[PDB]
Write an enzyme that holds these catalytic residues in place. Structure first.
Site, PDB file in Angstrom:
ATOM      1  CD1 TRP A 157      -5.771  -4.060  -5.264  1.00 27.95           C
ATOM      2  CD2 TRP A 157      -3.722  -4.371  -5.989  1.00 27.95           C
ATOM      3  NE1 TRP A 157      -5.838  -4.018  -6.667  1.00 27.95           N
ATOM      4  CE2 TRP A 157      -4.463  -4.281  -7.153  1.00 27.95           C
ATOM      5  CE3 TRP A 157      -2.375  -4.527  -6.315  1.00 27.95           C
ATOM      6  CZ2 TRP A 157      -4.178  -4.044  -8.416  1.00 27.95           C
ATOM      7  CZ3 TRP A 157      -1.744  -4.152  -7.671  1.00 27.95           C
ATOM      8  CH2 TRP A 157      -2.684  -4.469  -8.474  1.00 27.95           C
ATOM      9  CE1 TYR A 158     -11.061   0.282  -2.630  1.00 27.88           C
ATOM     10  CE2 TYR A 158     -10.167   1.232  -0.714  1.00 27.88           C
ATOM     11  CZ  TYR A 158     -10.949   1.220  -1.657  1.00 27.88           C
ATOM     12  OH  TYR A 158     -11.893   2.102  -1.518  1.00 27.88           O
ATOM     13  CG  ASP A 191      -8.760   7.191  17.554  1.00 20.13           C
ATOM     14  OD1 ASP A 191      -8.089   6.727  16.694  1.00 20.13           O
ATOM     15  OD2 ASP A 191      -8.588   7.667  18.539  1.00 20.13           O
ATOM     16  CG  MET A 235       2.910  -9.995  -0.922  1.00 15.05           C
ATOM     17  SD  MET A 235       1.930  -8.231  -1.284  1.00 15.05           S
ATOM     18  CE  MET A 235       3.033  -7.451  -2.036  1.00 15.05           C
ATOM     19  CB  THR A 236       5.736 -16.194  -3.090  1.00 14.85           C
ATOM     20  OG1 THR A 236       5.923 -16.088  -1.213  1.00 14.85           O
ATOM     21  CG2 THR A 236       7.108 -15.486  -3.381  1.00 14.85           C
ATOM     22  CD  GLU A 244       0.015  -5.493  -2.553  1.00  9.93           C
ATOM     23  OE1 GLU A 244      -0.568  -5.636  -3.326  1.00  9.93           O
ATOM     24  OE2 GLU A 244       0.021  -5.594  -1.384  1.00  9.93           O
ATOM     25  CE1 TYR A 245       2.707  -5.331  -6.701  1.00  7.10           C
ATOM     26  CE2 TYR A 245       4.108  -5.808  -5.118  1.00  7.10           C
ATOM     27  CZ  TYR A 245       3.083  -5.998  -5.809  1.00  7.10           C
ATOM     28  OH  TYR A 245       2.446  -7.338  -5.294  1.00  7.10           O
ATOM     29  CG  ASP A 285      -2.817 -13.266  -5.221  1.00  7.62           C
ATOM     30  OD1 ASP A 285      -3.454 -14.305  -4.752  1.00  7.62           O
ATOM     31  OD2 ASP A 285      -2.894 -12.084  -4.634  1.00  7.62           O
TER      32      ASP A 285
END
EC number: 3.2.1.14
Lengths: 496, 497
Positions: free
Chosen positions: B95-96, B66, B210-211, B142-143, B213
């Protein structure tokens, strides 16, 4: 289960008021023409037409002499002495009264709008039934629009409730009072109420599809008015059902409603069966005892699929009665429609007609080469195929418009009866042909399939098949990580 | 109104716990690489990632030291001394953590389920924000899909309520606390929540699309991963929006969602603008500071639109690092992705790459003819077009993943700032080309049209146009005797002035 054979008995008011059985100039088709034998070949007679009046009750046309009318109905109900299964139904509506631009359209719309008007209407239906001695109610509104559908449904439910009560009060468990409607037989009108078809059909004994008038002078290209299957050489039509308020996805709509499509009897039947909650046993196929005629047709295809010069307006906008050999047409002042009775006479009368056969649509037609006329009609041969389809598809039976258009021997009705019930008639080898079938798939006719159970936690590729919640599902794209019912990537394609 | 320039600052837990500014083998991108000038070029930094724990609260990875986390965050928030408009946001998800099969996905789903869970979650978000010194919240789930979207909307609404009160409480009306989300940039994921986009965006300052991938080794054909406009020569895709629960007719679905279509940045932006109640000023265009690489490509079109022999699975399942010159790829153990920093070094390193340009998509690509390699990436040149589009379409600004992938001098960030704000940059004559535009039309973005009023009692022929109840309507077939237009026969095609 015996197939229903439902014939309309249509009598105009002036014939009621001058009713005789002994002068065909004044009543062409009196009840005495329905002989004991004809009565035994019928399961239902739809006495037509009553209306809804400005009080928003079921009612006779006001110019009717009531004693005459009660007398005509009593002649029809006396026929039950010859056939203990026979029902004399009465019809409310029809095109003239109830179409959108029709003289009584407003009452249809208003009768079904409130609980109060629906109870008044429903009661009036039962009252009329009981007072005149009818055995059920046939509603022929052509056609409630999406706004009106919920009220029409509620009206049908109320009539059903009342009729069932009346059956028990009258001890009619052996022959209960019935409720039917005349339903659209083509997608354009059907799209008005299609989304709620299960609700419409639940209160009914039968929905009688008006699977005729699928061609006419209002269309630019001549065609068969009651083709069983389609002919790729014939016209095709926009599939209006894809625009109905179903709430379905683009894939679901597309798979259910190919467009353009062939406007056929089979299309209408399959379109009903595509909806869940619509049992085949309640669907009755309508057939016409009349033909539709067109002038100014060209050669090449026996008059089929031709431009023409036939006015489409009602009434017939002229005095030219150009259907060679058609005596009834001049009496009825319209050369665009002719009974089977009259067509048979024309054909054997050396008037220039050739009878041809379309083996895709499984229907006959006449061509008059000298004058450039085309007639689409049905006969005992087309009825073999229609009767075989009714049996094969487990439909409820057949309906026709109208009894007075049969020939004097009653041959079309006899043919229908024969194909369903004669022990020495065998249609096992009747070839149904290669005409186009309607192939849409809907929630009501998914094919039986098998697939492995969906596994949560698994990732699926495009085209993957799983079973879930008792259906078989397919992915529409790849890397699918959630479940059928909960991820729009899945399309329901079968039933376990 | 100044365009947003939103940069992610991503640091994994092990780098926080071992944070140093003097060893790039340990921390390749320390906060010290963000100079006062770079700080002035940013409007937001999204510090990334925090998560949702099993108590259904916002939390750090429990493996985080921390003290060390506070120090990293302090280094970022110290940057506000140089830019009184700058916000250090923190991101929850990514994502993860948050993908359907991700380690914490259940916590996302469950946190948004009820008024009590949403309250406890939202309060934890504001608590963390104030405890560590952040300026707002970025949700990066996501998502959400299906039954989760209503929960998600109500969660965003509650965060908003609590942040607005915190703003007053704290006297922060000059730099109010903000709320953003990372949104899907392509139609497959967007279809999950598309039908409720207006409700999702209402509580937000921005939705950061997220335009990128939009291509990758997981697809069979090589392509640009962030094409601005489409190339007819390139691959096209199923338009999944057609399968969203919209209640639209076949005609409506077809007109709004052309299929197949070009998976481009423009398509995602216009798909958002197609929906009623989604303001352009809240839409932020994401851009990548990294490229994606493919091997086994064919040569007729510089490696574009080729089959390939690149694994699409993650993690990279091999020990073979075939992206020539990419030593970053070796360190990170994956030759299919490279930072701009590294790609630019490759281009200066005479390794055999050719830099090429697609004048339809307005993006660059690398081709290695000897080794059969293809790289899709963005640079300062493709950003000219993307910035011009942001201006012309009146978008809120730009977002990028991620700061650490810019070159050491910060040239990609400096370029975006330049194109939006520099006096000596003039893109008035920049030609946006003839690449394919997305031209779907939704019942929520109908043009003004003019037609005679519908006349009851009238029979209308096919393709007739009438005005009724605020819209212009077209018949889909003839002999129409009904009024417009829930009625099947009428199609809403325009809006009445």
């Amino acid at each position: 289960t015996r197939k229903a054979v439902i014939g309309y008995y249509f009598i105009p008011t002036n014939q009621i008021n001058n009713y005789t059985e002994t002068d065909t100039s004044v009543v062409p088709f009196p009840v005495s023409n329905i002989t004991p034998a004809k009565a035994k070949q019928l399961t239902h007679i739809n006495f037509s037409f009553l209306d809804i009046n400005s009080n928003l009750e079921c009612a006779w046309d006001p110019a009717t002499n009531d004693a005459k009318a009660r007398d005509v109905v009593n002649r029809l109900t006396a026929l039950k002495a010859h056939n203990p299964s026979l029902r004399i139904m009465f019809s409310i509506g029809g095109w003239y009264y109830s179409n959108d631009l029709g003289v009584s359209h407003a009452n249809y719309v208003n009768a079904v709008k409130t609980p109060a008007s629906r109870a008044k209407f429903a009661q009036s239906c039962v009252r009329i039934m009981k007072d005149y001695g009818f055995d059920g109610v046939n509603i022929d509104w052509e056609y409630p629009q999406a706004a009106e559908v919920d009220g029409f449904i509620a009206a049908l439910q109320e009539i059903r409730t009342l009729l069932n009560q009346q059956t028990i009060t009258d001890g009619r468990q052996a022959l209960p009072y019935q409720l039917t409607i005349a339903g659209a037989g083509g997608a354009f009108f059907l799209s008005r109420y299609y989304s709620k078809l299960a609700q419409i059909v639940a209160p009914l004994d039968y929905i009688n599809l008006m699977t005729y008038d699928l061609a006419g002078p209002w269309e630019k290209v001549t065609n068969h008015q009651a083709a069983l299957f389609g002919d790729a050489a014939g016209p095709t039509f926009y599939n209006a059902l894809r625009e109905a308020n179903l709430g379905w996805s683009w894939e679901e709509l597309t798979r259910a409603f190919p467009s353009p499509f062939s406007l056929t009897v089979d299309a209408a039947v399959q379109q009903h069966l595509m909806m869940e909650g619509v049992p085949s046993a309640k669907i009755v196929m309508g057939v016409p005892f009349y033909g539709r005629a067109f002038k100014g047709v060209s050669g090449g295809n026996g008059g089929q699929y031709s431009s023409h010069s036939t006015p489409g307006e009602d009434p017939y906008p002229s005095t030219d009665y150009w259907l060679v050999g058609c005596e009834e047409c001049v009496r009825d002042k319209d050369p665009r429609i002719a009974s089977y009775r009259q067509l048979e006479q024309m054909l054997q009368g050396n008037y220039g007609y050739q009878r041809l056969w379309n083996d895709k649509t499984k229907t006959p037609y006449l061509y008059h080469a000298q004058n450039g006329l085309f007639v689409t009609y049905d006969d005992a041969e087309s009825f073999k195929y229609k009767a075989k389809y009714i049996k094969q598809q487990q439909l409820g039976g057949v309906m026709f418009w109208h009894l007075g258009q049969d020939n004097r021997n009653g041959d079309l009705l006899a043919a229908l009866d024969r194909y369903f019930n004669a022990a020495d008639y065998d249609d096992s080898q009747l070839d149904m042909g290669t005409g186009l079938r309607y192939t849409g798939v809907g929630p009501g006719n998914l094919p039986i399939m098998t697939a492995p159970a969906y596994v949560p936690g698994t990732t699926y590729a495009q085209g993957a098949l799983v079973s879930y919640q008792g259906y078989v599902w397919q992915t529409k794209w790849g890397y699918i990580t959630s479940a059928p019912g909960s991820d729009s990537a899945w399309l329901k394609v079968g039933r376990v």
